[PDB]
Amino acid sequence: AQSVPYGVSQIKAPALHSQGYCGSNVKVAVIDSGIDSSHPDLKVAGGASFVPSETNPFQDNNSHGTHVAGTVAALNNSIGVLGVAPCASLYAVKVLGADGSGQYSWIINGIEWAIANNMDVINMSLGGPSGSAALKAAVDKAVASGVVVVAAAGNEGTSGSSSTVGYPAKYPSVIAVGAVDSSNQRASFSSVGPELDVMAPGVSICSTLPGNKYGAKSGTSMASPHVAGAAALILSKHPNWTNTQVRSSLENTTTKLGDSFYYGKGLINVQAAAQ
Numbered sequence: 001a002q003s004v005p006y007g008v009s010q011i012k013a014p015a016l017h018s019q020g021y022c023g024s025n026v027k028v029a030v031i032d033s034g035i036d037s038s039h040p041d042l043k044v045a046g047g048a049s050f051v052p053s054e055t056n057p058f059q060d061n062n063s064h065g066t067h068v069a070g071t072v073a074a075l076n077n078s079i080g081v082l083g084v085a086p087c088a089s090l091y092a093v094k095v096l097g098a099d100g101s102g103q104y105s106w107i108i109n110g111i112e113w114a115i116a117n118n119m120d121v122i123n124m125s126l127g128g129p130s131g132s133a134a135l136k137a138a139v140d141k142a143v144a145s146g147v148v149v150v151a152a153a154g155n156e157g158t159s160g161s162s163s164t165v166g167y168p169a170k171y172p173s174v175i176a177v178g179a180v181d182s183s184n185q186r187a188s189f190s191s192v193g194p195e196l197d198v199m200a201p202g203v204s205i206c207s208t209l210p211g212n213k214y215g216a217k218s219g220t221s222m223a224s225p226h227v228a229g230a231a232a233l234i235l236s237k238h239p240n241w242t243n244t245q246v247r248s249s250l251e252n253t254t255t256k257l258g259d260s261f262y263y264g265k266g267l268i269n270v271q272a273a274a275q
């Protein structure tokens with residue numbers, strides 16, 4: 001039997017699925033630890049590895065990339081779970097090793113690859129406390145080229161009155177995603193600041209794991225792919241919308257929560273965003 005993870009329903013994805021909108025022909029790049037292409041509930045279309053010691057993008061020695069990928073696009077069938085955009089074309093852009101860390105050079109290499117390969121949506125469930133001109137240039141180039149760039153906000157919680165949003169989420173060109181639970185309450189770990197854009201489910205998220213498994217994980221890493229998948233749904237309904245239009249629609253139709261420093265614009269609603 002297939003289960004629908006709470007988070008998928010919470011952002012109102014199933015409403016679109018019912019209409020026949022599931023992200024078909026939308027190219028989504030998961031820039032992370034790779035995706036287990038052998039998982040029966042996923043379909044990987046392609047990708048690349050930029051980790052020097054782990055040349056196969058289709059082997060996830062961490063489990064993080066695979067989990068993120070399932071939130072985006074676990075297949076609509078009779079097993080496992082269901083992704084926000086189950087018909088999307090999924091790409092494994094491996095920039096993180098087995099330990100879940102990776103060099104900036106590798107990440108930037110992955111964004112450059114995504115732009116050159118005409119990805120529609122980029123998901124980056126990763127972050128560092130420091131930026132670089134090259135990192136900023138790459139995300140800006142992607143947006144300038146019409147790509148929707150989504151990133152996790154960070155898991156740093158609160159710190160007095162300062163922003164704890166990480167990079168590249170901190171850049172204006174990137175959509176920065178914080179995490180809520182099933183009751184719409186902000187997760188205590190979710191990073192905060194004026195650079196936070198939207199919220200999505202991020203606590204105890206069930207998704208795919210390598211080796212034909214499924215398990216829950218919590219983090220802004222789990223929130224981001226709900227927004228990435230939401231963008232893919234929008235593009236499947238309005239293929240001529242620009243990245244700017246997708247972004248504005250997502251931000252403009254949220255369910256408002258508390259203060260924007262903690263919740264950004266609020267919780268995404270893909271049904272409202274899709275018009």
Ligand SMILES: [Ca+2]
Nearest residue numbers: 075077079081
């Ligand atoms: Ca499934």
Ligand SMILES: [Ca+2]
Nearest residue numbers: 169171174176
């Ligand atoms: Ca941002």
